[PDB]
């Protein structure tokens, strides 16, 4: 997160770190056995780390659980990042608590104007590179579909929304990928992509989770 704040230990109990020897992506716990992330975060031998603040220190609220199964969306296009969503089953259920907790799925899509919390261990600088150990937060509004398409011509499908500030300065960034965009207690977004970080007229692009609920529910019901 660029130009955000330190969330605070466990203040976002649904944030997970995807770990393959190292944090490489964010994720969101949606029940005791499943995480939602970005498809472009797919790789094998993932361990899900829940209850994390400092990802480089064991501080006492962690649960480390290996992924048993990953499922990229059937229609994921790695080239356009269309349908950038993925579900990961945990090898055992997480012990759900105040600091480790699922975030609800949307019943409807959110609108332009809605305030949302984006979070992740990604790079904190818009130029140059600095990775935080503790989780970083950003409050950002969903931007209109027309301004999103205008910022990114020929790239914004119906499965993406922009969130952030057109002035720049505040955005998600490298390492936030697959992480939560939570709006009014509901997971509305997954950190998908952007042109750099916090650049003017170049806000973050998010997977529109409301388009995927049916698939998420149907999938978790049979796996
Ligand atoms: C803005 C932005 N830029 C680049 C990346 C690379 O994944 C991400 C997520 O990893 C991101 O959110
Ligand atoms: Ca830790
Ligand atoms: Cl519009
Ligand atoms: Cl267009």
């Amino acid at each position: 997160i660029v130009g955000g704040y330190t969330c605070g230990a466990n203040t976002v109990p649904y944030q997970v770190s995807l770990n393959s020897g190292y944090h490489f992506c964010g994720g969101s716990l949606i029940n005791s056995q499943w995480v939602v992330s970005a498809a472009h975060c797919y790789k094998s031998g993932i361990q899900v780390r829940l209850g994390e603040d400092n990802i480089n220190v064991v501080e006492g609220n962690e649960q480390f659980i290996s992924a048993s199964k990953s499922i990229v969306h059937p229609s994921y296009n790695s080239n356009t990042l269309n349908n950038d969503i993925m579900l990961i089953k945990l090898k055992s259920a997480a012990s759900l608590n105040s600091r480790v907790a699922s975030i609800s799925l949307p019943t409807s899509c959110a609108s332009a104007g809605t305030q949302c919390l984006i979070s992740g261990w990604g790079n904190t600088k818009s130029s140059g590179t600095s990775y935080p150990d503790v989780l970083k937060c950003l409050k950002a509004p969903i931007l209109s579909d027309s301004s999103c398409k205008s910022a990114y011509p020929g790239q914004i499908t119906s499965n993406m929304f922009c969130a952030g500030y057109l002035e720049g300065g505040k955005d998600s960034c490298q390492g936030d990928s697959g992480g939560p965009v939570v709006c009014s207690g509901k997971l509305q977004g997954i950190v998908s992509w952007g042109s750099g970080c916090a650049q003017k007229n170049k806000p973050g692009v998010y997977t529109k989770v409301c388009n995927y609920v049916s698939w998420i529910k149907q999938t978790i019901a049979s796996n």
Side-chain angles (χ1 to χ4, degrees):
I1 308 299
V2 169
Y5 61 102
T6 293
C7 307
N10 305 118
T11 58
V12 188
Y14 52 84
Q15 172 84 47
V16 323
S17 176
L18 307 186
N19 186 287
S20 66
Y22 53 87
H23 170 89
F24 71 88
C25 267
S28 308
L29 191 75
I30 53 163
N31 67 30
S32 61
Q33 304 192 292
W34 293 87
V35 168
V36 196
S37 193
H40 86 253
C41 289
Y42 163 81
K43 58 162 73 174
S44 65
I46 296 176
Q47 175 194 73
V48 176
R49 300 181 167 218
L50 308 81
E52 279 292 16
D53 193 26
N54 196 314
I55 46 165
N56 275 314
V57 179
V58 173
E59 308 162 290
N61 298 299
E62 297 81 2
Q63 303 180 43
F64 297 172
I65 312 166
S66 286
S68 65
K69 180 184 289 169
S70 286
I71 308 164
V72 169
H73 191 274
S75 301
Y76 169 51
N77 187 311
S78 70
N79 289 318
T80 64
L81 263 26
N82 202 20
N83 308 297
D84 188 20
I85 185 171
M86 163 186 76
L87 283 166
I88 314 167
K89 198 191 186 170
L90 308 176
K91 270 176 174 146
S92 43
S95 338
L96 291 192
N97 58 50
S98 61
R99 296 163 192 268
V100 184
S102 48
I103 185 58
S104 305
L105 296 176
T107 53
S108 57
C109 304
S111 311
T114 319
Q115 288 282 334
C116 303
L117 181 72
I118 313 167
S119 62
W121 287 275
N123 184 8
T124 62
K125 276 76 206 149
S126 55
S127 289
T129 283
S130 189
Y131 287 87
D133 300 316
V134 303
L135 180 72
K136 294 286 182 181
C137 276
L138 175 49
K139 287 186 181 162
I142 300 172
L143 297 156
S144 48
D145 176 54
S146 65
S147 71
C148 189
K149 294 175 184 307
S150 264
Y152 293 108
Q155 298 183 88
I156 300 301
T157 74
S158 50
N159 296 313
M160 307 165 178
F161 71 87
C162 294
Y165 303 81
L166 297 182
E167 48 265 52
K170 291 187 261 187
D171 201 11
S172 58
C173 205
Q174 42 260 2
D176 300 319
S177 290
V181 178
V182 163
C183 319
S184 316
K186 309 278 169 34
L187 175 71
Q188 287 288 0
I190 294 164
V191 180
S192 179
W193 62 278
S195 160
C197 302
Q199 301 305 291
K200 185 183 70 173
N201 292 304
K202 292 289 171 189
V205 192
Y206 298 95
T207 306
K208 188 165 186 180
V209 181
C210 57
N211 293 356
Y212 294 108
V213 169
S214 296
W215 167 83
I216 297 170
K217 290 197 177 302
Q218 147 72 252
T219 296
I220 63 189
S222 302
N223 296 267

